[PDB]
Scaffold this motif. Structure first.
Motif, PDB file in Angstrom:
ATOM      1  N   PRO A  45       0.808  -1.228   0.000  1.00  0.00           N
ATOM      2  CA  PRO A  45       0.000   0.000   0.000  1.00  0.00           C
ATOM      3  C   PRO A  45       0.838   1.274   0.000  1.00  0.00           C
ATOM      4  N   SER A  46       0.234   2.375  -0.439  1.00  0.00           N
ATOM      5  CA  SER A  46       0.887   3.679  -0.419  1.00  0.00           C
ATOM      6  C   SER A  46       0.526   4.436   0.856  1.00  0.00           C
ATOM      7  N   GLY A 103      -1.722   1.629  -3.607  1.00  0.00           N
ATOM      8  CA  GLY A 103      -0.584   0.736  -3.489  1.00  0.00           C
ATOM      9  C   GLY A 103      -0.063   0.284  -4.838  1.00  0.00           C
TER      10      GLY A 103
END
Lengths: 267, 267, 267, 267, 267, 267, 267
Positions: A44-45, A198
């Motif tokens: 994920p981001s 992500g």
């Protein structure tokens, strides 16, 4: 006259995720029993926003880091080749040199003039392709393979080091002076898909083992470096400035391979 | 020396539609019994218009959202890899620096002049490709895979946040000041095929299960977010403005897979 | 270890034509007995001209419409996937910002001058690709699949809604003021092949049926929408204007498939 | 478990030529016995020149026409699909809007001036691809398939309808005013290969027949439409003008297929 | 269930060379016994130079000509298809129309001026691709297939018909006024590979024969047309002019094929 | 039902090197027993520098020459086809014609002026691709195949015949006036890889032999033509001039093939 | 009817790494027993920085060097072909010549003027592609194959020899005058992946051995040449200058192949 023994396992832990999908090779004509593994995971981001009327703060990932570590107990197994690898970058260059000549004839109220003109031209253009995220291979040894995926610059043309005396760093600024903190950050529409949600990775690697092959251990280590970018309202306009890593989220995933049983497992 | 057992099922519900078309793998050399599923469905846009002489209202889809959820009862099955995935965006950059020199000779009524000229040039161009709809992968875990398909901007170059003091948002405006409400919206001719008619998706995903594999459940969830864009006649010209989600249509589709019988079914 | 049973049939009716060419699949490992059908037909444009010295009238097809309807009697069969489908359109964007500085030295009759110049430049270009006919998928359900092929604009750059106070709509105008009615329409040379002669379609679709499969019915429905475009000589120049659908030619084609006999037939 | 029975025949007649090369299919799983035929022939252009000191006349082919007619005696056989077919033409559009600002400082003999400049820019470019000969499919029914190959325009940019008050139609004019009639026509060097020498065609088509299949007849009909283009010396310069079809050469070729013997023959 | 019988033969004669490499087909399901032949030969250019201080003469090939003649004794065999064949040439067209407006503010010694400017722009560009040698198929019948490979123009942009009152034809001129006759011709560096050294051809062709097939005869005929281009020193500068065919070298190659023995031979 | 007998041999001699790697074909259906040979060797450039404070001398290869000679003792064997071969070069041409009109309004101290402007534009651009080394096939007969690889020009745009009254030939000049002899030559960075280090070749060729085939002889002959380019310091600036072949290094390699034993050997 | 015996081994030594992965060929129809080896290794860049307030020093790799040495004890084995090899570089050239004519009409206070203008244009553009690192093959003999990978220039357009009287060499300079020594070097963001992290190589090579084949030795030799680039603060601005090789790290890797046992090993 060889046999191939596929196998795979996956783990998540906190919504990160790693997919270790391997294929073993028991070739009789090959002295060493080799295997190859593909790492098709996700990470994920965690793009988060906090704001107010006169203040904003968008947390975003500046660079990802994925390192794969092999560990043979007898120390016979060694990661041979590791994909992806680095490539020499190409740039398009073009130079030009021209010359234009001419003249004119004029007249204004019973008075006729005329002239000549000569001019010379030169221009040196340099085109090339820049990715939003540069993927460099940092390390690659007999038991380690590290890769970094670091942010280059926006489509607009702003980097981490951009600075303007008035607006500061214009990275991720929707408006110079209009909407408030939380609403002033760039919408996921224009953002790079890596930051919006992500993204990454895809890393392959072959490891050569002897016929003795009993056990080995691979270890996938994700590390996301999160930079905090803030917006401070300086009365007349927005002034953005970019700090760095307050906390760097990290997750390891231990994979163990049995070669006698031809299977791959987690932990 | 493996066997492949294909299977498929589809459901519609209200003209949405989901096609779950899977292929099971019973490889003896693979410790885990794996399957892979392709989701080749369709979902309407429902572009609707309501208007009058001095007022218009076009309902249109701003962003689609498709999430696939796996659910193992024993909790052994785990969605390994999920396509599509995100990619690092590339941009073409090009810088140039030139210099042009010259002179001239003139004359006007028994008076001859002449001159010299020098000039310098610099230009920094930045090309790139922007899709009408950005497809970002939002989530991807051991039992979930979410994808968003959000509107970027028109070929004309207008986005959701565009604003002009006079005409407001010029998104979907056929004429600034000519034809009436219902007739003032952009014809399907120039519109993006995604908004003109139903569009999306295409999502693949592999799930690895053990030899025990008895039952699993996949769940496809479509959600369409509809923005209402209105046109208000401000006496002299049209003034458009864009609201958002009045209602967000949603449809779930429960698919169950039997691994002992090698079949896929609805509900 | 599966078997494939090909089959095909075609019908014309008034020079339209539909080719239904299917391939049945009796896979033992597949629980549902599936088939896939390709529709490789043809449909005329019927570009007709009527004219005089001071008047013209070219009838032409503005949009085609092809809908395929499935109909299971027990209602088990359902059109799974339907090609073609819609795609997110891409546009090339490029922005540039430059600056040019310089100076000069002049002299005219014992009087020497000189100067300085500074300039700044900005340009936002937006390229993209527009087809002469946009092909949008209108509907796609468990028993219906509609496709529209609608006219976008000419290579010259004129659409159905183009208007000029003097010449009116310049669509299909060979000359603004020279030749007479019948001779003033655009020759098939420059026209789009879709309007010059019959064109379209190519639509594929898979339908999944159970082992019980006895009979199903597919139905191909062509509909051509013909706009009448007229030229009225306004003394000094030609004034074109475009009306619409006076009559819309339509043709249905009933195809029935027998799954027990593995054959496809007309009616 | 099907069998394929190839066969072929060719005829010339006056140096035209048609190659009918077919492949029959006796598939047991297919209810209808189908065949497919490729037409890989050749047809001359017959570019002829007649001239003098002050007059020229080049005969050339404006448009070719190839029609294939099927004829079943029992009337069971029907040409299903016919290649080539028409395609929606694509055009590249690009719009730009810029703005440039600046200023200057000048001085001429103890008198210093200075200034400001502002400018705005807009440009709408439209690129596309035009073939020297447009190939449109005119007709396609159960027993007919017609194709036209008509002249669009020269690489220079002249069409059949080009006109200039002085030089007339500049099509095929080597020189405006220099060399004489026969020598004034464009050399085969720059001409399109279609006009320089014989060219075309390549047309495929499938016909579906029942198991009864005894005999069928295909008929290939070439027709070349020859325009006469003349050059008249108007004292000071050349004045070209283009007439049309004085005579249109035509050649038919009767092919008969026996399905019981699995052979194709001429007449 | 067919058999293929390859065979080949080659002959040189004076350094020309023809390679006839054929493949026979004895398919039982095909009523006619067919063969196909590839002609992969070579032919010299013989670029020769003769010169002095004030005179030059470069002999070079303007156009090549290759004709293949078949000859059946019973007259059953007929060359069906012959490659290469002609193709419709494509040209890229692009039109643009812009408009630029602005103004200015000036001042020179206590006297302030100002102005407005408006401008309009139009441009019609036409790009296309021109080969150094156009390859046109001249003839193609039941027993003949002729191909011409004729010179178009130089990369510099000069053709056979180029003329300048001063320098004459600048084709193959290294310098307008510097070096002497033999040294003034263009070096093989910049020349087209076709003229620098021997080049061409590559021609394939299928011939269909009956089961009776005993003997046939193919005949390859090369003909090179050599233009003599001369340079005459006109005191101040070079004046080039191009004559034509003084002698046209020609070479025939008789190939005979035996179908009963499945072999190809020379003479 | 044919057999293939591979074989290979290589020799070096002075660091040149030739790899003769052949494949024999004993096809029963082919009357002639044929073989094909690939020549994948290497040859050094030997770029050498000699210099001082006021003088330099870089020896470099202007053109390479590779000739392959076959020699049958009975004289039955003949080199049929020889790759690479020459290709017709293509050039991109583009012509444009525009027109721009406008006007202006001015005023300076209670005196208002105004004007009109008209302009016309024409431009003929010609793009094409030029290789740093042109590879022309010089000869190709029944027992010889010669190829030349000659230097065209630098990326900078200088050829062997370039001349400037002041700097002479600027080929390979790093600086016009700065660094000394040995240091003034162009670094391997910017040079063509062919001159920087050894390069070439890759030549294939098929030879057809009868069933009798006992022995044949191929002979590879490399010849490198080395031009000496010198730099003479003319007090104020560098003056380069290019001489030619002082010595031309040459190396032959005799390969003999036995067809009865199906082997290839050196000498 | 041949057999292939794969084998592989790898070694690291100080984090360099070489992967020797070979495939042996025991073809009965081939007189010589041949093998082919791929070298898919990795080698670090070791980009190190040392700095202060007024001084910096970045060590970086200017050129890599990989040489593979074969060594047969009986001296029968010889490296036949070695990939990669050099290629002739291509450059795009384009020349243009235009002419623009026009006129004007003006008036200022009861005094009407007018004029004519003529102009001519010429431009010679030269585009080409330059890699950040040129890969030239230096040597290739019967028992040696050397390759160099040398730095060309930055995307910005700076090389090793760049010089400016004020800023010196601007290579790797982030800012001309702003931040301090360690922070003034270019970030890995914009750098070439080769310098940012370890990179290269990929070298293949075939070696032909006789049936006797008992033992051979290959030897991989990496050598990295490190240039030291320093930044000296000259009071007002930064002045960069580039030294060279203080130390050149080198690592050899001895690989031995047994052909009787069909295995490859280290040392």
């Amino acid at each position: 006259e060889a046999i191939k023994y596929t196998s795979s396992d996956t783990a998540s832990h906190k919504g990160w995720k790693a997919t270790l999908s391997g294929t073993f090779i028991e070739d009789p004509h090959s002295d060493k029993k080799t295997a190859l593994l593909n790492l098709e995971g996700f990470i994920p981001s965690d793009k988060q926003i906090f704001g107010s009327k006169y203040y904003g703060k968008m947390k975003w990932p500046e660079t990802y880091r994925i390192n794969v570590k092999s560990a043979d107990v007898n120390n016979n197994i060694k990661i041979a080749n590791s994909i992806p690898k680095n490539t020499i970058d190409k740039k398009d260059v073009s130079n030009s040199i021209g010359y234009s000549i001419g003249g004119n004839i004029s007249v204004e109220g019973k008075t006729a003039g005329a002239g000549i003109n000569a001019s010379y031209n030169v221009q040196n253009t340099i085109s090339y392709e820049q990715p939003d995220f540069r993927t460099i291979q940092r390390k690659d040894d007999a038991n380690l393979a590290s890769w970094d995926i670091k942010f280059v610059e926006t489509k607009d043309g702003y980097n981490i080091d951009s600075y303007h005396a008035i607006y500061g760093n214009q990275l991720f600024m929707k408006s110079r002076l209009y909407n408030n903190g939380d609403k002033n950050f760039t919408d996921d529409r224009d953002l790079s898909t890596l930051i919006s949600g992500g993204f990454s990775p895809n890393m392959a690697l072959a490891l050569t083992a002897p016929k003795n092959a009993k056990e080995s251990v691979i270890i996938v280590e994700y590390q996301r470096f999160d930079n905090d970018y803030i917006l401070n309202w300086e009365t007349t306009q927005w002034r953005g400035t970019n700090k760095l890593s307050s906390t760097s989220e990290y997750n390891e995933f231990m994979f163990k391979i049995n070669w006698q049983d031809h299977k791959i497992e987690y932990y």
